[PDB]
Design an enzyme around this catalytic site. Structure first.
Site, PDB file in Angstrom:
ATOM      1  N   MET A   1      -7.464   1.283  -6.830  1.00  0.00           N
ATOM      2  CA  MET A   1      -7.180   2.679  -6.829  1.00  0.00           C
ATOM      3  C   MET A   1      -8.314   3.346  -6.072  1.00  0.00           C
ATOM      4  SD  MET A   1      -5.505   3.609 -10.428  1.00  0.00           S
ATOM      5  CE  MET A   1      -4.991   5.233  -9.846  1.00  0.00           C
TER       6      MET A   1
ATOM      7  N   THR B   1       0.527   9.571 -15.251  1.00  0.00           N
ATOM      8  CA  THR B   1       0.565   8.769 -14.015  1.00  0.00           C
ATOM      9  C   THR B   1      -0.154   9.418 -12.832  1.00  0.00           C
ATOM     10  OG1 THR B   1       2.747   9.592 -13.365  1.00  0.00           O
ATOM     11  CG2 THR B   1       2.651   7.548 -14.692  1.00  0.00           C
TER      12      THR B   1
ATOM     13  N   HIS C   1       7.571  -7.278  -2.039  1.00  0.00           N
ATOM     14  CA  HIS C   1       7.165  -6.606  -0.788  1.00  0.00           C
ATOM     15  C   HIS C   1       8.033  -7.148   0.358  1.00  0.00           C
ATOM     16  CE1 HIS C   1       3.778  -4.617  -2.580  1.00  0.00           C
ATOM     17  NE2 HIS C   1       3.022  -5.696  -2.714  1.00  0.00           N
TER      18      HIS C   1
ATOM     19  N   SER D   1      -5.050   2.453   4.047  1.00  0.00           N
ATOM     20  CA  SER D   1      -5.121   1.851   2.706  1.00  0.00           C
ATOM     21  C   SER D   1      -5.187   0.320   2.846  1.00  0.00           C
ATOM     22  CB  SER D   1      -3.915   2.328   1.870  1.00  0.00           C
ATOM     23  OG  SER D   1      -3.939   1.836   0.548  1.00  0.00           O
TER      24      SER D   1
ATOM     25  N   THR E   1       1.684   0.086  -7.283  1.00  0.00           N
ATOM     26  CA  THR E   1       0.976   0.268  -8.569  1.00  0.00           C
ATOM     27  C   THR E   1       1.425   1.557  -9.284  1.00  0.00           C
ATOM     28  OG1 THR E   1      -0.900  -1.025  -7.736  1.00  0.00           O
ATOM     29  CG2 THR E   1      -1.325   0.382  -9.689  1.00  0.00           C
TER      30      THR E   1
ATOM     31  N   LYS F   1       0.798  -1.228   0.000  1.00  0.00           N
ATOM     32  CA  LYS F   1       0.000   0.000   0.000  1.00  0.00           C
ATOM     33  C   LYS F   1       0.838   1.289   0.000  1.00  0.00           C
ATOM     34  CE  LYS F   1      -3.273  -1.052  -0.660  1.00  0.00           C
ATOM     35  NZ  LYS F   1      -3.558  -1.669  -1.997  1.00  0.00           N
TER      36      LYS F   1
HETATM   37  N1  LIG Z   1      -1.393   7.376  -9.738  1.00  0.00           N
HETATM   38  C1  LIG Z   1      -1.523   7.314  -8.363  1.00  0.00           C
HETATM   39  N2  LIG Z   1      -1.335   8.406  -7.579  1.00  0.00           N
HETATM   40  C2  LIG Z   1      -1.469   8.400  -6.229  1.00  0.00           C
HETATM   41  N3  LIG Z   1      -1.765   7.285  -5.550  1.00  0.00           N
HETATM   42  C3  LIG Z   1      -1.998   6.117  -6.217  1.00  0.00           C
HETATM   43  C4  LIG Z   1      -1.861   6.039  -7.673  1.00  0.00           C
HETATM   44  N4  LIG Z   1      -2.167   4.758  -8.047  1.00  0.00           N
HETATM   45  C5  LIG Z   1      -2.408   4.081  -6.903  1.00  0.00           C
HETATM   46  N5  LIG Z   1      -2.322   4.893  -5.811  1.00  0.00           N
HETATM   47  C6  LIG Z   1      -2.550   4.547  -4.382  1.00  0.00           C
HETATM   48  O1  LIG Z   1      -1.536   3.677  -3.806  1.00  0.00           O
HETATM   49  C7  LIG Z   1      -2.168   2.801  -2.864  1.00  0.00           C
HETATM   50  C8  LIG Z   1      -2.036   1.358  -3.392  1.00  0.00           C
HETATM   51  O2  LIG Z   1      -0.687   0.977  -3.148  1.00  0.00           O
HETATM   52  P1  LIG Z   1      -0.126  -0.460  -3.638  1.00  0.00           P
HETATM   53  O3  LIG Z   1      -0.064  -0.304  -5.129  1.00  0.00           O
HETATM   54  O4  LIG Z   1       1.218  -0.556  -2.958  1.00  0.00           O
HETATM   55  O5  LIG Z   1      -1.123  -1.523  -3.208  1.00  0.00           O
HETATM   56  C9  LIG Z   1      -3.629   3.219  -2.792  1.00  0.00           C
HETATM   57  O6  LIG Z   1      -3.756   4.274  -1.803  1.00  0.00           O
HETATM   58  P2  LIG Z   1      -5.168   4.607  -1.068  1.00  0.00           P
HETATM   59  O7  LIG Z   1      -5.731   3.259  -0.575  1.00  0.00           O
HETATM   60  O8  LIG Z   1      -4.713   5.553   0.001  1.00  0.00           O
HETATM   61  O9  LIG Z   1      -5.980   5.297  -2.161  1.00  0.00           O
HETATM   62  C10 LIG Z   1      -3.824   3.738  -4.202  1.00  0.00           C
HETATM   63  O10 LIG Z   1      -5.009   4.489  -4.375  1.00  0.00           O
END
Ligand SMILES: Nc1ncnc2c1ncn2[C@@H]1O[C@H](COP(=O)(O)O)[C@@H](OP(=O)(O)O)[C@H]1O
Length: 253
Positions: free
Chosen positions: A214, A204, A85, A115, A42, A38
């Site tokens: 997301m 992005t 991870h 998250s 991504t 989190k």
């Molecule tokens: N382009 C972007 N800009 C900002 N945050 C992003 C993003 N794409 C994904 N995220 C956020 O990164 C977190 C997911 O992380 P991971 O990819 O490590 O699982 C989520 O946070 P939130 O749950 O706070 O929205 C997600 O919404």
């Protein structure tokens, strides 16, 4: 069901594939993207991919009889872009020996907790997180898949002084994405084209990527979840766990 390695909860198929994961042969030109869950996997993957393209095997992933993350990685042409991870303790040791590039993204503990809570709710492969009040304690105790936020971030922060780690912060990318993405281009040995950089920044954004979990993609959603009582308890535990470490986080935009 979850299994454990050295007390860290992991997906069962991961643990079943542990000896293959640990004997993985890294290569000096590998780029390893490393995040606590989190913290921005991504997002940073999309950034790296766009930079590569211009304008990834999960090492610990397994699901027999499909090819495992290490089987996929073993066959990938160099330079390989890979992800994990894993904490520094659990990382296959070949990555240290080959002086690989590591791209680490950290994110504040409070926003990570929020998250991860919603992710565990929406994802059938992750355990029910209980109520918010229950999950709060669970997350502080590190009883989540891939282990403690504290141990993860402390370990990777320590290693940055001895290994080729570009150590970024989610909140810095949100605040000034061009400034941070420029650093990734440089780390990846790319000639910085300002025009390509500008395209990567715009493509992005959370808004662009969301249309194509997301969830909200901001900094400070923790303030909507934490009670003041939870916050005071958290800050005290955080002070104790993070005592003496030089890392600092932004908690809001
Ligand atoms: N382009 C972007 N800009 C900002 N945050 C992003 C993003 N794409 C994904 N995220 C956020 O990164 C977190 C997911 O992380 P991971 O990819 O490590 O699982 C989520 O946070 P939130 O749950 O706070 O929205 C997600 O919404």
């Amino acid at each position: 069901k979850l299994k454990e390695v050295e007390g860290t909860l992991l997906q069962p198929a991961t643990v079943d594939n542990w000896s293959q994961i640990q004997s993985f042969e890294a290569k000096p030109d590998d780029l390893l993207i490393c995040t606590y869950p989190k913290a921005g996997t991504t997002w940073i993957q999309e950034i790296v991919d766009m930079i590569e393209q211009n304008g990834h095997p999960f090492i610990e992933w397994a699901r027999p009889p499909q090819p495992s993350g290490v089987e996929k990685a073993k066959a990938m042409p160099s330079p390989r872009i890979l992800k994990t991870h894993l904490s520094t303790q659990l990382l296959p040791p070949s990555f240290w020996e080959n002086n690989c590039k590591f791209l680490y993204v950290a994110r504040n503990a409070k926003d990570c907790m929020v998250s991860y809570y919603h992710f565990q709710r929406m994802n059938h492969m992750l355990p029910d997180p209980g109520t918010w009040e229950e999950y709060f304690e669970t997350f502080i105790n590190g009883k989540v898949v891939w282990g403690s936020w504290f141990d993860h971030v402390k370990g990777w922060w320590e290693m940055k002084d001895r290994h080729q780690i570009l150590f970024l912060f989610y909140e810095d990318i949100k605040r000034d994405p061009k400034h941070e993405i420029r650093k990734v281009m440089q780390f990846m040995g790319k000639k910085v084209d300002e025009t390509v950089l500008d395209k990567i920044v715009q493509e992005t954004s959370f808004e662009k990527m969301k249309e194509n979990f997301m969830r909200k993609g901001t900094v400070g959603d923790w303030k909507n979840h934490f009670t003041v009582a939870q916050n005071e308890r958290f800050d005290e535990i955080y002070r104790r766990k993070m005592e003496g470490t030089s890392i600092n986080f932004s908690m809001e935009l």
